[PDB]
Amino acid sequence: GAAEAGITGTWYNQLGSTFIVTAGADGALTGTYESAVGNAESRYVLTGRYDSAPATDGSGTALGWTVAWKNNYRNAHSATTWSGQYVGGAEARINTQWLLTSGTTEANAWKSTLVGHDTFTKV
Amino acid sequence: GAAEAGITGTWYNQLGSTFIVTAGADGALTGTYESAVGNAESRYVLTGRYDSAPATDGSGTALGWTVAWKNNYRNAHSATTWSGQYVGGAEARINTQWLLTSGTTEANAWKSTLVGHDTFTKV
Amino acid sequence: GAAEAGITGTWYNQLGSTFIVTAGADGALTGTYESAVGNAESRYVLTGRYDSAPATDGSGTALGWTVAWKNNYRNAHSATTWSGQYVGGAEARINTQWLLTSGTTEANAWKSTLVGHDTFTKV
Amino acid sequence: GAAEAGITGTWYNQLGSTFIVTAGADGALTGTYESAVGNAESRYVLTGRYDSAPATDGSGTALGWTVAWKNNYRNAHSATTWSGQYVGGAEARINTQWLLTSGTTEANAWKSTLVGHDTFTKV
Numbered sequence A, B, C, D: 001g002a003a004e005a006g007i008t009g010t011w012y013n014q015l016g017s018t019f020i021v022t023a024g025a026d027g028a029l030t031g032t033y034e035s036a037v038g039n040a041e042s043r044y045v046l047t048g049r050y051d052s053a054p055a056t057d058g059s060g061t062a063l064g065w066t067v068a069w070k071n072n073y074r075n076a077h078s079a080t081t082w083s084g085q086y087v088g089g090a091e092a093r094i095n096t097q098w099l100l101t102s103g104t105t106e107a108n109a110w111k112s113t114l115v116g117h118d119t120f121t122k123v
């Protein structure tokens, strides 16, 4: 469907990170994420979900995905989730907010979670 | 491994929602989510990621997952991501913060995303 | 009014931090905050706002406040804002989410902001 | 000081909202906020705090403020807090994340809080 075809592709955010994703027929997202910043090297697996029958009333398409920051090169003992929506057209965009949680002790849990926002384009 | 065995199971949060999850050998999370609140009925598919080799220095295990709120019964045109950490022991807990994004028009995008926090126990 | 009298007092959160506040007649909050954790020593000035005519339909009373983490003892070059609601009764509570932003370079801005949640009681 | 003089002024965000603020000598922020969106009319009082001795190592200046959405025209029974940092130069900017909490019943508290991000310029 249109949402599947719109989301599937290679995206970059304002940091220069690379988000490569395939949207499955009934709501799955799979792919890889490479961060331009932080305790990260090479590509990391991601999985997520999207609304595979979005409203055709002008609304965006809701989606989210997770990366755990462990691969064959490094392990930052952390995970980021991005929550957002896809907007199509000639200059398609995925607008997100994200939560990055690091494994911490309980005493340090108050400072376990960063929040931010990333906007992705196919350029 | 211990993280995999610790995370895998049936969990409930402070709202009475039900989180059924299986952790895979190298970082995958799969299962179902049923919300006690909101525009939701029955179970929804979830997928996510966790740190499959967490630090054994007393830190929790970082993880995250996504639900897109479409199933055979309803479609709320939204997605939630939970980002958090697993702590084991006799009273194991998953402590999370979450972001729920609804598909909106651009004019309404400023109010597209709710934030909250859920704590899950195996009880 | 009832909201003013309910909010005004000495509160503690789940970390053991101390929140001393006076609510003014038409929406002002003033007082001090002492954190049990982080780069902090002694009391810090806070200011904020609350809804001075909340709905009497069972809803809580919306409020927020800010602390900049500079006083005569230390300066962490950061600020926290708490956003939440007051609920009264015999065991009154202020339930909040918060954002802590540290001054950073632009290159590090992606990791400038922590998010969490604090619940305060008068005990 | 430089931070005080930099922050003080009239700012606008990407929604067209207007943020008029005066920074006081030792950390106070006072002024008014007018939102281009939502349940809002005319100007609302704001108060907040900033780091009045920021690090001069290239870091931004941490700050935050609150608006309770009650004035002589309307009362939305809500409050927003913005948490962020000021960056100066020829094209000065205040980059923020925000939390908007509405008064709700306990049953609806899970959906009490919106999160977003606003960037302000003096243009």
Ligand SMILES: O=C(O)CCCC[C@@H]1SC[C@@H]2NC(=O)N[C@@H]21
Pocket: A013, A015, A017, A034, A035, A036, A037, A038, A039, A040, A069, A076, A078, A080, A098, A100, A116, A118, C110
């Ligand atoms: O440092 C870590 O713990 C792992 C890398 C985190 C990179 C974050 S994820 C959110 C933000 N968006 C990016 O593309 N990179 C950062």
Ligand SMILES: O=C(O)CCCC[C@@H]1SC[C@@H]2NC(=O)N[C@@H]21
Pocket: B013, B015, B017, B034, B035, B036, B037, B038, B039, B040, B069, B076, B078, B080, B098, B100, B116, B118, D110
């Ligand atoms: O209303 C919707 O759009 C779908 C249901 C959302 C339920 C949310 S997800 C975060 C929070 N935790 C829960 O267990 N339920 C709510």
Ligand SMILES: O=C(O)CCCC[C@@H]1SC[C@@H]2NC(=O)N[C@@H]21
Pocket: A110, C013, C015, C017, C034, C035, C036, C037, C038, C039, C040, C069, C076, C078, C080, C098, C100, C116, C118
């Ligand atoms: O470390 C700093 O930069 C200053 C202290 C921050 C303490 C935070 S504010 C949110 C949370 N709630 C608390 O009572 N303490 C922490």
Ligand SMILES: O=C(O)CCCC[C@@H]1SC[C@@H]2NC(=O)N[C@@H]21
Pocket: B110, D013, D015, D017, D034, D035, D036, D037, D038, D039, D040, D069, D076, D078, D080, D098, D100, D116, D118
């Ligand atoms: O609808 C309300 O409850 C009151 C108005 C809220 C407007 C919000 S505050 C965060 C965001 N930034 C803006 O300039 N406007 C919206």
Ligand SMILES: O=C(O)c1cccc(C(=O)O)n1
Pocket: A024, A026, A027, A028, A029, A048, B030, B031, B045, B046, B047
């Ligand atoms: O049974 C299914 O279709 C299923 C189960 C878990 C995840 C997914 C998915 O991500 O599609 N699909």
Ligand SMILES: O=C(O)c1cccc(C(=O)O)n1
Pocket: A037, A038, A039, A040
């Ligand atoms: O940007 C960061 O926080 C970062 C980057 C590389 C390594 C580390 C680390 O080892 O903490 N941290």
Ligand SMILES: O=C(O)c1cccc(C(=O)O)n1
Pocket: none
């Ligand atoms: O400069 C950094 O990234 C840094 C410094 C100290 C600790 C950590 C960490 O614990 O990630 N990271």
Ligand SMILES: O=C(O)c1cccc(C(=O)O)n1
Pocket: A041, A042, A043, A073
């Ligand atoms: O997968 C990659 O791009 C990769 C893997 C290891 C090192 C580097 C690098 O040094 O860029 N890049």
Ligand SMILES: O=C(O)c1cccc(C(=O)O)n1
Pocket: A054, A055, A056, B075
């Ligand atoms: O066939 C349907 O259920 C349908 C068709 C269009 C929109 C929607 C919706 O927005 O639920 N639902």
Ligand SMILES: O=C(O)c1cccc(C(=O)O)n1
Pocket: A073, A074, A075, A076
């Ligand atoms: O990213 C990692 O896995 C990492 C980083 C520093 C040291 C070590 C180690 O000593 O294993 N591991």
Ligand SMILES: O=C(O)c1cccc(C(=O)O)n1
Pocket: A070, A071, A072, A073, A074, A075, B053
């Ligand atoms: O080089 C390392 O230390 C390394 C590499 C990959 C994963 C891990 C880990 O999971 O610690 N550590």
Ligand SMILES: O=C(O)c1cccc(C(=O)O)n1
Pocket: A038, A039, A076, A078, A102, A114, C111
């Ligand atoms: O994984 C890391 O190094 C990391 C993660 C979150 C924050 C920080 C930091 O603030 O250094 N570092």
Ligand SMILES: O=C(O)c1cccc(C(=O)O)n1
Pocket: A030, A031, A045, A046, A047, B024, B026, B027, B028, B029, B048
């Ligand atoms: O190639 C892989 O192992 C892979 C790719 C995508 C997702 C996952 C996963 O979620 O394990 N694993």
Ligand SMILES: O=C(O)c1cccc(C(=O)O)n1
Pocket: B037, B038, B039, B040
């Ligand atoms: O809790 C909610 O917001 C909710 C619950 C059921 C339906 C709807 C809706 O149809 O918006 N919304």
Ligand SMILES: O=C(O)c1cccc(C(=O)O)n1
Pocket: none
């Ligand atoms: O009471 C509710 O849940 C409600 C009311 C109006 C609109 C919506 C919505 O758009 O979800 N939801």
Ligand SMILES: O=C(O)c1cccc(C(=O)O)n1
Pocket: B041, B042, B043, B073
């Ligand atoms: O999967 C379920 O539990 C389910 C499915 C449809 C309706 C209901 C219900 O009405 O509880 N429950």
